[PDB]
Design a protein around this ligand. Structure first.
Ligand SMILES: CC(C)n1ncc2cnc(Nc3cc([C@@H]4CCNC4)nc(N4CCC(F)(F)C4)n3)cc21
Ligand SMILES: CC(C)n1ncc2cnc(Nc3cc([C@@H]4CCNC4)nc(N4CCC(F)(F)C4)n3)cc21
Lengths: 291, 286
């Protein structure tokens, strides 16, 4: 069973499908309207046929259903009907920051600062629940028509969670196992501070339209990160960005997780504490997107 | 694809003498080579055979006296027969379940021989990951052979599979990339397992054997976990207690390598030889 609170009914009983927004490996996403309230929702539809593995989708729903924070996409339930699973969420009309910057070009420093503050608020909430997003990037940060910021796409977090559960199920007898082996099997070998690093990379992505080393073979990038002299990336254009932005990048991209600041600590950084960070900055961006 | 597979009937080459066990992976036989008379172990198998493929490749690429020797594989009638050196006494667990606890000198010899095998494996960039009495075999001359690389193969396969579906890495933190490529721990896990095995041979159970395994996993993953110890202090020399202390070093950054452990007083002392285990096998028989 995918989730103990699934609605075993046709989602079309409750929603009018308005537009297919896209589709691929993850399934398809629809814009729909609540037939009673008139509110808009996103429906993510995935095939869910007998003997398919439900574990990843199960974990994704578990994450969404237990979050109640403005900066995490709101969850309105899931439907299982005729071997399709529909996950219903708050609609973000502008899509992701990647959808936006592919049209607008690079964001301003103030726009990036607001985005980073909103993402850090969502991360601090997730971390206080002992959750880890594990896939912070422009493609997974959604923007609504009011310029508000929502973390979404917990698929990677759910995949990791489901694999972690499978590791525990088949760990075998533990009595000869070294503690660090048990720790990797139970906890994964890293912690929530990985999300802070990913946010620093995301800030570079919003500034430059690509993450660092985007043109290097992925396996080479992984290898370089494991060398003892690996150097965190930096913003390319020194004079374009303030010292505060360069320092935000420096501290979020702290190599050692033992020394990397938490989401709550980062919320005190000058870049995201400064006045004038509000959704109007992103309304400006969305106007550019249409103008 | 193993390029050396013999595409012919193994029974045209070996006389099957005794089924030793198996299931549901397959069956294990004691067999005799038809031309030489040497005994061998034949493991018959058969799905996704890929992890078994990786397991055979481990055995095939190892060439060390303390690793059970590999002779070849026969493919016949959708059954793969893996031919290995025969160890007539079985595992140390098979033995101690009859004889009772080993002497300190017997344990010292076993530990030296396992450390030699581990030093070889680690230099080959392999991790055994399942060192325990059940996986250490004893031949009829009292010599020690590491065996059962099934866990090593399974963990390597699973590390490779995760790597294949890791997705794009450009937003990943370095510690996440390191877990993806290197698995989150290293070969020093085998040194810890050897320390537990030494307690097992001394006491007939690993520490915490009567604690629920999920509780053991809970305790071991907390920052305050204390490494176990031998329970009957006066029975064992200071050198044995110290060997346990250092092999069971909690921090993998401080735990000694197999080569370093081979210089420890317990395993470098004189009088450690296969005659000690021949005595054990005599006790097993008599
Ligand atoms: C991650 C996804 C399952 N998800 N989760 C919650 C959520 C809330 N709102 C949206 N909103 C949007 C808006 C737009 C706008 C159309 C025109 N430009 C962007 N596109 C898209 N997607 C095009 C590619 C897709 F995967 F189909 C989605 N989603 C998507 C949402
Ligand atoms: C790990 C195994 C596949 N393997 N690999 C190489 C190898 C070389 N020699 C043996 N020798 C023995 C001796 C004995 C002795 C019979 C009387 N007591 C132990 N039993 C067993 N088996 C009991 C349960 C099994 F898996 F079938 C094996 N194997 C086993 C070997």
């Amino acid at each position: 069973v995918v989730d103990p609170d699934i609605f075993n009914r046709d989602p079309r009983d409750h929603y009018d499908l308005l537009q297919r927004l896209g589709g691929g490996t993850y399934g398809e996403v629809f814009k729909a309207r609540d037939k009673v309230s008139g509110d808009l929702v996103a429906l993510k539809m995935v095939k869910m046929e007998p003997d398919d593995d439900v574990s990843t989708l199960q974990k994704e729903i578990l994450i969404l259903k237990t979050c109640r924070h403005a900066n995490i996409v709101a969850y309105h339930g899931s439907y299982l009907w005729l071997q399709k699973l529909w996950i219903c969420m708050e609609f973000c009309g502008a899509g992701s920051l990647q959808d936006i910057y592919q049209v607008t070009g690079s964001l301003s420093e103030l726009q990036i600062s607001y985005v980073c503050r909103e993402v850090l608020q969502g991360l601090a909430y997730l971390h206080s629940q002992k959750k880890i997003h594990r896939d912070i990037k422009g493609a997974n940060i959604l923007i609504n028509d009011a310029g508000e910021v929502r973390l979404a796409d917990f698929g990677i977090s759910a995949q990791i969670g489901a694999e972690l559960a499978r590791r525990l199920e088949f760990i075998g007898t533990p009595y000869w196992m070294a503690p660090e082996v048990a720790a990797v099997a139970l906890k994964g070998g890293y912690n929530e501070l990985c999300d802070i690093w990913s946010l620093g990379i995301t800030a570079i992505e919003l500034a430059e339209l690509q993450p660092p080393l985007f043109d290097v073979h992925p396996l080479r990038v992984l290898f370089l990160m494991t060398k003892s002299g690996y150097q965190p990336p930096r913003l390319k254009e020194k004079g374009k960005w303030s010292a505060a932005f360069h320092n935000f990048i420096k501290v979020t991209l702290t190599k050692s997780p033992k020394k990397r600041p938490s989401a709550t600590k980062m919320l005190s950084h000058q870049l995201v504490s400064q006045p004038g960070l509000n959704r109007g900055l992103i309304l400006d961006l969305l106007d550019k997107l249409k103008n």
